[PDB]
Symmetry: D2
Subunit: 387 residues, 4 copies
């Protein structure tokens, strides 16, 4: 039961199942995986595709001949399995040169290098068929208030993204960009810390249509925010270009638990929203099998990500299709929320005594919302306890 299919579009970063287990306090617990191994194992589990940072696929500093051989082996694995590569990204965070940032490093020479590193990988992403290029500015930020003038940093970040947009336009590429917010870690505070801040920034770019967001479940939850609500705002703006699925158990370090772990009810409401809205992009997992696990546990954790999505999809669909739930949604006036407040227009509203002089506020205030019964139907559907 709950078997993944190609139409599910489940994807995984090479760095997810390939995470060797090094953490702030501990050495690696697993050997490095050849990307070819990961592609073949993920395909066996029913994944649709993989994603990569440049330096996951090609060791940093590789010669041109080494780069060609790494890509050739990877493409053979994709061909052997039918796996796709819908998204790629640049590693602008691991190498010590990026310790103060890539696009917003105080040092101008580093900013220029970061752009050249990204541009090289955009070319590769396009060659592999990627539709989305993600940017997670994990080093853009500060530990102290004097270190980073944020208005200047935002000017540099806009300049960088504008140059990348000029580049893809000039090359005729169809790829689009997705900015991944995170509030903190590894920097004390990271620039564009939430979906909202990223959406606002995009509106000030020269070609805003080329940019959207790649929200990650755990990153919004690291600020205590409601991830389904943030996804709704991204969908409302037309900017949900990609998504990163995982779990996070409260406000703390980025845990990258398998999807469905952490906040299970938020996972249910997320899947309900994505499916109801008809989100058509990859269901991408950015997770880390805990360092307690051997390789069998790695593959079990990856399988669990997909299984949990499929269980939640079933339960959310059953919730929405249940005539008792539809009745409860009407009892709670969800239908009215979807109707315009004043399609009659401003003057008619101003002239409408039913909206002011004749509005019976005490009668309105007496009406219960019936939200608790609706939520208990949702709980019963999630748990398969209807009756």
């Amino acid at each position: 039961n709950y078997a993944p299919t190609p139409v599910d579009r489940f994807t995984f970063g090479l760095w997810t199942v390939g995470w060797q287990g090094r953490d702030p306090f501990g050495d690696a617990t697993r050997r490095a995986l050849d990307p070819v191994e990961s592609v073949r194992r993920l395909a066996e589990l029913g994944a649709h595709g993989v994603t990569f940072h440049d330096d996951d696929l090609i060791p940093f500093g590789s010669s041109d001949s080494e780069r060609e051989e790494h890509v050739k082996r990877f493409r053979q694995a994709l061909d052997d399995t039918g796996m796709k590569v819908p998204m790629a990204t640049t590693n602008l965070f691991t190498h010590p040169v990026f310790k103060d940032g890539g696009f917003t490093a105080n040092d101008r020479d580093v900013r220029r290098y970061a752009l050249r590193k990204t541009i090289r990988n955009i070319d590769l992403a396009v060659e592999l068929g990627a539709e989305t290029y993600v940017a997670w500015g994990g080093r853009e930020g500060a530990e102290s208030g004097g270190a980073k003038d944020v208005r200047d940093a935002l000017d540099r970040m806009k300049e960088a993204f504008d140059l990348l947009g000029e580049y893809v336009t000039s090359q005729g590429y169809d790829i689009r960009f997705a900015i991944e917010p995170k509030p903190n870690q590894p920097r004390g505070d990271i620039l564009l810390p939430t979906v909202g801040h990223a959406l606002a920034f995009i509106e000030r770019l020269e070609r805003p249509e080329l940019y959207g967001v790649n929200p990650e479940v755990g990153h919004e939850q690291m600020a205590g925010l409601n991830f389904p609500h943030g996804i709704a705002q991204a969908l409302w703006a037309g900017k949900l270009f990609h998504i990163d699925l995982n779990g996070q158990n409260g406000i703390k370090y980025d845990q990258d638990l398998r999807f469905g772990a952490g906040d299970l009810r938020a996972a249910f409401w997320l899947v309900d929203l994505l499916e109801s809205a008809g989100y058509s992009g990859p269901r991408h997992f950015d997770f880390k099998p805990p360092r307690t696990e051997d390789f069998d546990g790695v593959w079990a954790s990856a399988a669990g990500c997909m299984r949990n999505y499929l269980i939640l999809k079933e339960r959310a669909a059953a919730f929405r299709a249940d005539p008792e739930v539809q009745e409860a949604l009407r009892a709670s006036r969800l239908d009215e929320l979807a109707r315009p407040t004043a399609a009659d227009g401003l003057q008619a509203l101003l002239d409408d005594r039913s909206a002011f002089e004749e509005f019976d506020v005490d009668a309105a205030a007496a009406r219960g919302m019936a939200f608790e019964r609706l939520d208990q139907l949702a709980m019963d559907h999630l748990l398969g306890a209807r009756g």
Copy 2:
């Protein structure tokens, strides 16, 4: 020392010093204050002005003759003291009719009433000389996932703000709107939970130039975010129309401590930013004297808000003017952060071997940022411990 002056533009809500002390668990500890009393006492402390919700100035449900008398007495107090009213707002949160929201209530009749209540108060705000009209949607949100379709709610919120913009345009008013984000409390999650989300929403309004943000120190800190960073993004966007100053000691209920309490170093960096950027709006305090205090403690707490701002202003100015700090800022390459990454343009960057093939990443990575010495100069200046 540290005496407020009119040019400081310190303002207070009537509901701040007038808070009677009722909390989720406790009855009022202070009697209600007549707004006339608050105006006269705040003027004696050196405040510039006050602000109000409709229902702070005019008891909810007042007749037209009662409304006129309340406003007349208030205007006499303003005239007697020279106090101004730069900002006003609507109470769309206290009355039970607003239990599921004002502009985004599921019930359409409540949404229409909320708009009429706001429009009535915009007229009054303009008559009293206010330049800014704040909206804090404290009831817009949910405790459960099925209760509020967030895409529909955002449609209703946009409709409401668009109607208000049509209204002020039609009346020829110069007032502008400022949206106040908050992540949670009193709703489990509030719509537009951060500065970023509010900035992004504004960009989708029909007349975006009429709307900005009113960020509150403690509200961004309730999501663990960096308040100076968020203010910087608002300033970068040209949208810091007003600000609410207070303190907050971590992630928890909205404490509304006096300004300077809570995160003192964030208060220092905030004042540094506002003064450096030349923010010209009111320095408005949205705080609550703790319910442990009698009226003498109320006025001491209000005086402390202004005193702390003035101390921090002095210390931040001394930091920026110190030649040793200016040298440290150059050592940390803050000057380079402010210079364009690639004013030579994309093609020149692509052709520049110094940005890729000839970039010595290991030499760049070896350079220290000297951020710790800069931050200790900042600490020494804040504490008046230079030497």
Copy 3:
């Protein structure tokens, strides 16, 4: 399905279903309930009993004749329904006299009054058959560092609890005390903020056997802590005298959601622990029906608390009884965790080369824990998705 029974021992505070909906920003949305009404309605839902603060049952300031009549009516309702009163508590937080505390108020006269108020209610609790007397010191704490010397406050808190222990001993009462920790709200920081701090304090009382803890799900989660882990430590110490069940959606104000809402997986692990350990006390709900609800929603929310406990009980029992789960627990060495490290004693351990010179650390480090497969079996059992 999932029908409460008397052996379930589900109990509710009068102040839970009776909460009128006043919050930091909003007026009451529901009329006050007569305790007689609440007893009869809760009995109809299958509750076992109720609990009370003094001032929930007897209006503050009542005459002796008024007190007798309120108690007589309440006892008739208990008799009419078969409901029990297993626990009572004192309200040392609502009245303005307690604004700086009860037992740890700086003013000595208030501390003495708080003790007399509590002693009066202990007598009543015993008359109604309560086995546990809860103390939640919601006003014990501070908003500022100079206001409360915590060593002195702990001396006063120990003095108060020691006097209460002397009182019950002197009267021959069998009741025991349970301290309810909370980290903050309504005070900026509350003394004894977690289960651990309360357990540590109890060990320094003169008669430690008379005191245990009353942990509340949401209060531990307001510090981001793992509630099942804290309950395990209380059980390990022999101190889980009572428990408060509810939900909490992250680190924020005390939400008091119905049980099962908030952190659903933590609720599952809690129920698993209570049932596995054979906890025999009341399953008490300290929750608040949201102020959006009318009375039908109040009773739906209360019913939901009990339903969710019963669903989780079924799923946790099925998890523990599944031979595949038992095999996975052995694969993860949960059996070994339960066996002594060195029952052979210290000298034998020191002499055992297999524990040092001959311990193959690399072979040990290669063994996977298989925790991910175990956790996915737990998820499958919770969701009823085994297969």
Copy 4:
């Protein structure tokens, strides 16, 4: 100004200034330091001593001859500088063998090895003159609910600490143990997550007098708790055997900022408490110079830790010595808090009409606490803005 002296007893872990800068996302930015270098540089800054984990001083897996040479070189550096070694600890967290714990690993063979590794290092600590042996159980915990039975884990943790107490007693050593709590990171939840939980656990050990706590500023703040309050409870219990000083900017990953950074006002109240209570132990810094820094920044950050302590010590002493502050403390009844509630005894309290029938609750409730004026005097003293 603000020059460290030997009587200040400032100490640093080898792993602090020696941190190479590897974080969850980034490679090392600094070369490894020879412990001899760190001892000599810290001495030049005015430090009193250093501390070590076994594997900071002796590379894991060293032969006996290698161990002797590493210790000999270290002792020569201590002799050359006059630096002391007041505390040592075991690394039971870095090596992959400890991925599920040391003392509470599910695998019994690992638990036994962890004990033998610790015992070997206790012998070395004693030879170097350490008075305190710290245990930070960073791997004791879980990411999932089924992985760790917490009652069994607490049994294993008690067994381990009891064996260590038997060991030091049997050898006649004067060293004592200090348990360092942390709520999470690197495990999803860590056992003994706060000072309170650790204090409670100690009370159940066989020889409780041998064990205390080593609280760390940032670790309590990772649960949003008040660090000065927790230190007060440890002092009240007689259990503050050692302390770790650093900074932490909210609830997030363990930042280990230099002391005084993060929550500056909490740092002020901490220093006030330690000095007022006469804490006589080391002022130990467990911090990490940010990975943005070169070695000059490392030493600047270490110097800043000590400088900030000394500034805060001066300001707290001036606060307590100011006759205006002493008057404000009396106005706020801090003197009354320190006096017994009922030294007259229980019967006298029960017979005292002034404590109940004749207590004027409304007159008592009208008295203001004057806490805001007291706190503003504290702010003025911290900032050196008296006047």
